[PDB]
């Protein structure tokens, strides 16, 4: 199905961030994914302190990877996101656009 | 300019200064208002303990520790010991709903320190540990 990967990456310089993004997308494709878009939300202070890979982060870069993958890939991809050391927090959700916007007549 | 009840944020610059220092540099008075005792510790913005005073350290014993007067005395003692270290303005961080919740702040004010903000930090679990059973008195 269509999935959205929300990625909170370590606050690094441009070359390291580009390399990490390439590595993530390469893993996605290696697991059978067709990537639609790579979207940058910016570098920002985290809502709270996140301790990942024996390092504490207060800031991070937010990215959105939209893709289509088989149902079996998701779990595998999660494992990869657990091993990457430059990812503060990676989470795969069903893409919000796929959910149907059911219409409403108002409050009964 | 309209007074803001919300505290200043470290990121966004603000014109509020207290004796030339910014909000995040003011000393912090941590009050723990337990049911039988109250403990006041003044620390610097960089977490340097300047003064400490609890109701047990000011001579009050057993049930006399958990009263308003004892917490006021502890606050006065902490305020004096912190005034001797160059503290005037403080940010109060209270924890717990004991009888000395407000008496400690009376004592701190009566000892000469000026309170610029009050913060509550009482531990509220989102259902972690199980509390004890209700007393069958």
């Amino acid at each position: 199905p269509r999935y959205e990967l929300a990625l909170i990456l370590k606050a690094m310089q441009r070359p390291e961030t580009a390399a990490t993004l390439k590595r993530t997308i390469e893993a996605l494709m290696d697991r059978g994914a067709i990537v639609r878009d790579l979207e940058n939300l910016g570098e920002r202070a985290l809502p709270y302190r996140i301790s990942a890979h024996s390092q504490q982060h207060n800031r991070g870069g937010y990215f959105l990877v939209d893709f289509y993958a088989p149902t079996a890939a998701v779990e595998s991809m999660v494992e990869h996101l657990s091993r990457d050391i430059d990812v503060i927090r990676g989470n795969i959700v069903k893409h919000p656009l796929t959910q149907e916007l059911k219409e409403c007549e108002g409050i009964v | 300019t309209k007074f803001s009840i919300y505290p200043p944020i470290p990121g966004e610059e603000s014109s509020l200064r207290w004796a030339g220092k910014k909000f995040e540099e003011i000393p912090i008075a941590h009050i723990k208002a337990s049911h039988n005792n109250t403990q006041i510790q003044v620390v610097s913005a960089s977490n340097e303990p300047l003064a400490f005073a609890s109701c047990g350290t000011e001579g009050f014993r057993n049930a006399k520790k958990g009263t308003g007067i004892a917490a006021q005395t502890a606050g006065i003692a902490a305020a004096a010991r912190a005034k001797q270290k160059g503290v005037i303005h403080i940010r109060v961080v209270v924890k717990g709903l004991g009888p000395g919740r407000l008496s400690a702040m009376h004592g701190l004010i009566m000892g000469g320190l000026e309170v610029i903000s009050i913060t509550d930090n009482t531990p509220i679990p989102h259902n972690g540990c199980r509390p004890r059973k209700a007393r069958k008195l």
Binding site: - | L97, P99, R101, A134, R135, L137
Partner: protein, 92 residues
């Protein structure tokens, strides 16, 4: 349980008195009962339980003004039931 129908229709004693005195003072320290009552700053002297545990008499200190005393009296009798419910809900 048809709530519409329902609404339509000694050493021990000293310890209980002390416990209830502390609990009632703690309840009055906040707006938990009501903001209006919180504004008046009612102070309690003692709590006395009847020998048969049929009623709890809370003795509140009066002020010198008479209109203030009357207002305090009115709000206290209007809020007593809410205090009882809060005390029983907190499992004091």
């Amino acid at each position: 349980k048809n709530w519409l129908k329902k609404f339509a229709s000694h050493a021990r004693l000293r310890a209980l008195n002390g416990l209830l005195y502390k609990a009632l003072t703690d309840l009055l320290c906040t707006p938990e009962v009501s903001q209006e009552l919180y504004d008046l700053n009612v102070e309690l002297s003692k709590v006395s339980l009847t020998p048969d545990f049929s009623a709890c008499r809370a003795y509140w200190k009066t002020t010198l003004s008479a209109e203030q005393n009357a207002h305090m009296e009115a709000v206290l009798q209007r809020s007593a039931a809410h205090m009882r419910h809060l005390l029983m809900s907190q499992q004091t």
